[PDB]
Amino acid sequence: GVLKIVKVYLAVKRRIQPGDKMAGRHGNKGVISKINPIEDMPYDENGTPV
Amino acid sequence: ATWWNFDPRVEWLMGYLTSHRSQKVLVICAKAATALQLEQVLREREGIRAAVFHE
Amino acid sequence: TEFLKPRLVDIEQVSSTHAKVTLEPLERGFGHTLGNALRRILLSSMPGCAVTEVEIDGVLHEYSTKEGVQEDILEILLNLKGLAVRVQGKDEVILTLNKSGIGPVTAADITHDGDVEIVKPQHVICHLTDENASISMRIKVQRGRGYVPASTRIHSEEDERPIGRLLVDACYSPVERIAYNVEAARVEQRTDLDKLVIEMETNGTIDPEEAIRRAATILAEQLEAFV
Amino acid sequence: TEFLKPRLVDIEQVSSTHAKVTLEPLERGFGHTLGNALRRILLSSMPGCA
Amino acid sequence: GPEEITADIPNVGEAALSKLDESGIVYIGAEVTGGDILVGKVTPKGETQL
């Protein structure tokens, strides 16, 4: 009764941002608050920005 | 079909085409088959909002 | 009350990436004002040359692969992304990379064009295995600033792109690390003073020199509404 | 490549002592650069008689 | 009347008939946003006239 069927498979590169769910091994999970630029973010006395 | 990348009536297609997309233009060629190749070519291999007018 | 005006003393080149920069003399409570303010521009902003667009024969989408190649397309997109490039004259440039045979594929296998100067002639791009195949590709390099990825580029245009023209996110910003030290200046007149040493690390696409002068220009450029 | 240049919009006088000052537009990650840098001068280096 | 899967709408064309190459379906690796078309499928609504 059903003539034809095709199957397309789709792909997407869907990204990290606020509202997502990232979680710690020990279940110390939470939400992304906001993506601070690397400037706002603090740094090591040996540079290395956090 | 191989002349795609070869002759300069295709290299022209771009340099002319590549900035003068703003206005619309009218091109007339040999016959059907010859322009069936162009469509395959330009529409994709260059990348234009192109369509077919044959007979 | 009269304001001392700080200057450049010496540039200590250590590598084509790394460089310290010593500055004296700055009055009390100014090493914290500028050094911080400078850094904030130096990361956020700054016009480095980086990769944007690529086309390859025999490939349709990024998620597929090519035979006789260890690495994947996205992997080669990823290796192109983190490239080092220099441009002299025009803004946008079109490179052609042609290598064939056994072994790795370093950037020095691209055609050395006039304006085109490469920083790392032993950087890893791609790998080959079988000796009856090759790779030809048209890469596109641009000068911009900050981070306009591929994503924001698929919604500010309507003329439509062709098939095969893949998109890497653009890493326009060159600098990868920066700090600033606050030591005591011994001028031979006054001992109250400090001097500003700014450490940096980068990909060499912009010189350690211009970088500093170019950023403090931007800084001042913003200050021009209050003079 | 061209950078946005911030300006003065309005000065809100409240007293001969107090005053707010509104400024737009500044690009991302510049409200922290200047505002801080401005303040540091405004306290520590403006020559008043006392 | 049996359904069909080639590019034959009386409504949408030739706007979205360059996402699709020809003759049936979305050409392998064709960049398509939400809303646009993939496989061209089309159904008869009776009326059968003669």
Swiss-Prot record, chain B:
Protein origin, superkingdom: Bacteria
Disulphide bonds in the chain: none
Job description of the protein: Transcription regulator that activates transcription by stimulating RNA polymerase (RNAP) recycling in case of stress conditions such as supercoiled DNA or high salt concentrations. Probably acts by releasing the RNAP, when it is trapped or immobilized on tightly supercoiled DNA. Does not activate transcription on linear DNA. Probably not involved in DNA repair.
Protein family (similarity comment): Belongs to the SNF2/RAD54 helicase family. RapA subfamily.
Subunit description: Interacts with the RNAP. Has a higher affinity for the core RNAP than for the holoenzyme. Its ATPase activity is stimulated by binding to RNAP.
Protein name according to UniProt: RNA polymerase-associated protein RapA
Species of provenance: Escherichia coli (strain K12)
Gene: rapA
